[PDB]
Write an enzyme that holds these catalytic residues in place. Sequence first.
Site, PDB file in Angstrom:
ATOM      1  N   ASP A   1       0.811  -1.217   0.000  1.00 32.13           N
ATOM      2  CA  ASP A   1       0.000   0.000   0.000  1.00 32.13           C
ATOM      3  C   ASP A   1       0.846   1.270   0.000  1.00 32.13           C
ATOM      4  OD1 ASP A   1      -2.097   1.892   0.277  1.00 32.13           O
ATOM      5  OD2 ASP A   1      -2.522   1.321   2.336  1.00 32.13           O
ATOM      6  N   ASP A   4      -1.398   5.347  -5.640  1.00 35.86           N
ATOM      7  CA  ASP A   4      -1.857   4.503  -4.535  1.00 35.86           C
ATOM      8  C   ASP A   4      -2.170   3.061  -4.952  1.00 35.86           C
ATOM      9  OD1 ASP A   4      -2.845   3.505  -2.129  1.00 35.86           O
ATOM     10  OD2 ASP A   4      -4.614   4.791  -2.100  1.00 35.86           O
TER      11      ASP A   4
HETATM   12  C1  LIG Z   1      -5.463   7.826   1.190  1.00 35.74           C
HETATM   13  C2  LIG Z   1      -5.506   6.364   0.789  1.00 35.74           C
HETATM   14  S1  LIG Z   1      -6.368   5.458   1.907  1.00 35.74           S
HETATM   15  O1  LIG Z   1      -5.532   5.362   3.079  1.00 35.74           O
HETATM   16  O2  LIG Z   1      -7.591   6.155   2.233  1.00 35.74           O
HETATM   17  C3  LIG Z   1      -6.745   3.900   1.369  1.00 35.74           C
HETATM   18  C4  LIG Z   1      -7.453   3.962   0.016  1.00 35.74           C
HETATM   19  C5  LIG Z   1      -7.759   3.237   2.311  1.00 35.74           C
HETATM   20  C6  LIG Z   1      -7.145   2.570   3.537  1.00 35.74           C
HETATM   21  C7  LIG Z   1      -6.028   1.592   3.165  1.00 35.74           C
HETATM   22  C8  LIG Z   1      -5.104   1.336   4.358  1.00 35.74           C
HETATM   23  F1  LIG Z   1      -4.536   2.507   4.800  1.00 35.74           F
HETATM   24  C9  LIG Z   1      -6.676   0.273   2.769  1.00 35.74           C
HETATM   25  C10 LIG Z   1      -6.592  -0.201   1.453  1.00 35.74           C
HETATM   26  C11 LIG Z   1      -7.188  -1.402   1.058  1.00 35.74           C
HETATM   27  N1  LIG Z   1      -7.030  -1.762  -0.245  1.00 35.74           N
HETATM   28  C12 LIG Z   1      -7.625  -2.764  -0.920  1.00 35.74           C
HETATM   29  O3  LIG Z   1      -8.403  -3.575  -0.432  1.00 35.74           O
HETATM   30  C13 LIG Z   1      -7.298  -2.888  -2.379  1.00 35.74           C
HETATM   31  C14 LIG Z   1      -8.017  -3.772  -3.201  1.00 35.74           C
HETATM   32  C15 LIG Z   1      -7.632  -3.799  -4.531  1.00 35.74           C
HETATM   33  C16 LIG Z   1      -6.551  -2.945  -5.011  1.00 35.74           C
HETATM   34  C17 LIG Z   1      -5.889  -2.093  -4.153  1.00 35.74           C
HETATM   35  N2  LIG Z   1      -6.289  -2.108  -2.868  1.00 35.74           N
HETATM   36  O4  LIG Z   1      -6.364  -3.169  -6.332  1.00 35.74           O
HETATM   37  C18 LIG Z   1      -7.246  -4.237  -6.726  1.00 35.74           C
HETATM   38  F2  LIG Z   1      -6.527  -5.300  -7.012  1.00 35.74           F
HETATM   39  F3  LIG Z   1      -7.974  -3.850  -7.757  1.00 35.74           F
HETATM   40  O5  LIG Z   1      -8.081  -4.534  -5.585  1.00 35.74           O
HETATM   41  C19 LIG Z   1      -7.888  -2.181   2.000  1.00 35.74           C
HETATM   42  C20 LIG Z   1      -8.022  -1.768   3.326  1.00 35.74           C
HETATM   43  C21 LIG Z   1      -7.443  -0.569   3.748  1.00 35.74           C
HETATM   44  F4  LIG Z   1      -7.581  -0.188   5.033  1.00 35.74           F
HETATM   45  N3  LIG Z   1      -5.191   2.114   2.077  1.00 35.74           N
HETATM   46  C22 LIG Z   1      -5.468   3.044   1.245  1.00 35.74           C
HETATM   47  N4  LIG Z   1      -4.590   3.242   0.254  1.00 35.74           N
END
Ligand SMILES: CCS(=O)(=O)[C@]1(C)CC[C@@](CF)(c2cc(NC(=O)c3cc4c(cn3)OC(F)(F)O4)ccc2F)N=C1N
Length: 381
Positions: free
Chosen positions: A37, A223
């Site tokens: 991530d 991301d």
């Molecule tokens: C500002 C970014 S954020 O912090 O809000 C956020 C979007 C959400 C929170 C977190 C953890 F910090 C997060 C990400 C995920 N991903 C996925 O489940 C996932 C699933 C996917 C993917 C990429 N990923 O590509 C795919 F293959 F198409 O399918 C799950 C739980 C989390 F808790 N990470 C981020 N990058």
Amino acid sequence: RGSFVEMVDNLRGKSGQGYYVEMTVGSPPQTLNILVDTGSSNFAVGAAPHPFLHRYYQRQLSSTYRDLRKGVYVPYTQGKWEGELGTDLVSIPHGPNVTVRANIAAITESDKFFINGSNWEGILGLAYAEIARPDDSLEPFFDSLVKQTHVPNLFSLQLCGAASVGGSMIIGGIDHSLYTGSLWYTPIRREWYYEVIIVRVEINGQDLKMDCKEYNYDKSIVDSGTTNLRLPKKVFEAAVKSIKAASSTEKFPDGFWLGEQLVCWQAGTTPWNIFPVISLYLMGEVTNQSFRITILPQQYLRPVEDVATSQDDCYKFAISQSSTGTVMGAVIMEGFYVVFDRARKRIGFAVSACHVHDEFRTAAVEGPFVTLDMEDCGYNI
Ligand SMILES: CCS(=O)(=O)[C@]1(C)CC[C@@](CF)(c2cc(NC(=O)c3cc4c(cn3)OC(F)(F)O4)ccc2F)N=C1N
């Protein structure tokens, strides 16, 4: 070095569930699958027997575990996790031949965080300390890795889409077999997220002709922890209007474009050719110079395989609207080999040797182009 054969194909996953790497934590080593991530900065792992989890960190079994006697509560826009901070010895079996003392958030309570049916039990936050929780004194994993070892301050990602997914996380370098043509570099605007500047947007070669500041309101990030290409509201509206007009050979319900419903076709008869290419011009390394990255419908129309109520091939429109700026998620990254060149504050893009395409069209990285006022494209508070 340019060739890291031990690290090729070290990523696994399922469609829509993300890309994970095998890691070990503690002494003796406890094996866990960890989501890669680039959009967060905490190394956080399941440490309690949540029913969705295959495996979890058992601190009581580790002689090298050290308690930091501090908690951390992490709310997201959808769900949440809470954990207890500590340090332990961490290694990557199919990564560099090293062992690092890293910060680990031992997850003790969560909501809408772990995926039911997924094969991962933690998150490797690869972004910078500024966005680490609870604050920037909690050193992210990659910062610790570089500080404690001779591993160069660089990693690269080849995410291979299209149901098991795969790819490579090359830690400490670049593997030239993973891409074709040249790498093109865009500056990391600021070391918090992997923040970049989009300077121009084309749909099938046709400019959106928007104020470029809109493309980066309030930011643009790379991301690997996001599925979609996420665009700011006004940019999404213009992009969809243009994609509609480019694809007007067939008509689809309004809900499809909003990701409120799926669209299904007869098996092997998807009209990819009716759907346009999407190009993002990124700020180049040189004043007034940019480059263009181009994706295909193969990247942004994503198959949904877990549809029990249909027998056909169903797809999700994976471009969506955002309140937090542009997010270049897996929709973008699956087209490219992406080099996170931390040492030089830059991100490299090249055509991925594994990207899904047809015989008419290919994902592309092209330059140089002349783009003026690129600094005006960045948003300031
Ligand atoms: C500002 C970014 S954020 O912090 O809000 C956020 C979007 C959400 C929170 C977190 C953890 F910090 C997060 C990400 C995920 N991903 C996925 O489940 C996932 C699933 C996917 C993917 C990429 N990923 O590509 C795919 F293959 F198409 O399918 C799950 C739980 C989390 F808790 N990470 C981020 N990058």
